[PDB]
Design a protein around this ligand. Sequence first.
Ligand SMILES: [Cu+2]
Ligand SMILES: [Cu+2]
Ligand SMILES: [Zn+2]
Ligand SMILES: [Zn+2]
Ligand SMILES: [Zn+2]
Ligand SMILES: [Zn+2]
Ligand SMILES: [Zn+2]
Lengths: 152, 152
Amino acid sequence: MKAVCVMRGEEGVKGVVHFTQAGDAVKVHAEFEGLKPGKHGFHVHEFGDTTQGCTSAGAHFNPHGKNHGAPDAAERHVGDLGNVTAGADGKATLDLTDKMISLTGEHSVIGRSLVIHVDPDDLGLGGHELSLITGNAGGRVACGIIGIAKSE
Amino acid sequence: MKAVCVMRGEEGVKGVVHFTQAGDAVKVHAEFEGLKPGKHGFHVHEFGDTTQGCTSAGAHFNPHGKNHGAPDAAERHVGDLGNVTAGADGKATLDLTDKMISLTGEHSVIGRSLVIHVDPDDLGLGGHELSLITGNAGGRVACGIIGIAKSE
Ligand SMILES: [Cu+2]
Ligand SMILES: [Cu+2]
Ligand SMILES: [Zn+2]
Ligand SMILES: [Zn+2]
Ligand SMILES: [Zn+2]
Ligand SMILES: [Zn+2]
Ligand SMILES: [Zn+2]
């Protein structure tokens, strides 16, 4: 099973993100250009709604109502995929394996949204009231809808 | 259960389409501007892939291997939602109930694409080589990925 998400928002920011269901895990391959050098929070938000740009994407996909956290943490949202690190040339690549999200079933992220943020995801540890909620990653630089892709 | 699809394409063409499911019946509500007057084929295509504009949307969503038909025909693709009619000023509106598509299960259209065509869907009767495949509706004026929406 395969998924793709093309991400857009602020001028110059471009992102493509491939997903591949591999048994009980999903492999994620994401690339970006046009980012500010440094770390950017990267999440699956709940809605595939772009009627209000990235704003209508809602909050972090959290079907279990748990606290925000790191991809590798005990407590986290299904949609918590950490930070994307933008290099000096404003470009980033991120590969990961996540057994939280799915391309099928109740954890499916099909038809939901990917959002990349202005600031870093403090991963629930920032000591800010937003930390266990959004990771305090600030505003939404680009977002996109997760659509079914050709499962070759 | 709700779903939304923001459609976009050639200069000027805008479109928003809301889905609401109750039981086996999906209400499809569409508002378009910027179209050429007359009928435009209107289908759910298989992929929510926008890596190559609307081209990567693939062909019509057809999980049961049927020929193309009108929405109310004996035989049709799941994704066959017929024609949208654009007025003399380019505006169009559609409100149709369909019991083939779904926002869930094997017929789920979540994360697939909505496409609108430059020419009319001949409903599989136009007697042309592409009639029973695509309804001979020609190129693609606009599309969007169908995303999960606030169900309220
Ligand atoms: Cu986020
Ligand atoms: Cu079509
Ligand atoms: Zn790549
Ligand atoms: Zn979170
Ligand atoms: Zn669960
Ligand atoms: Zn068809
Ligand atoms: Zn069926």
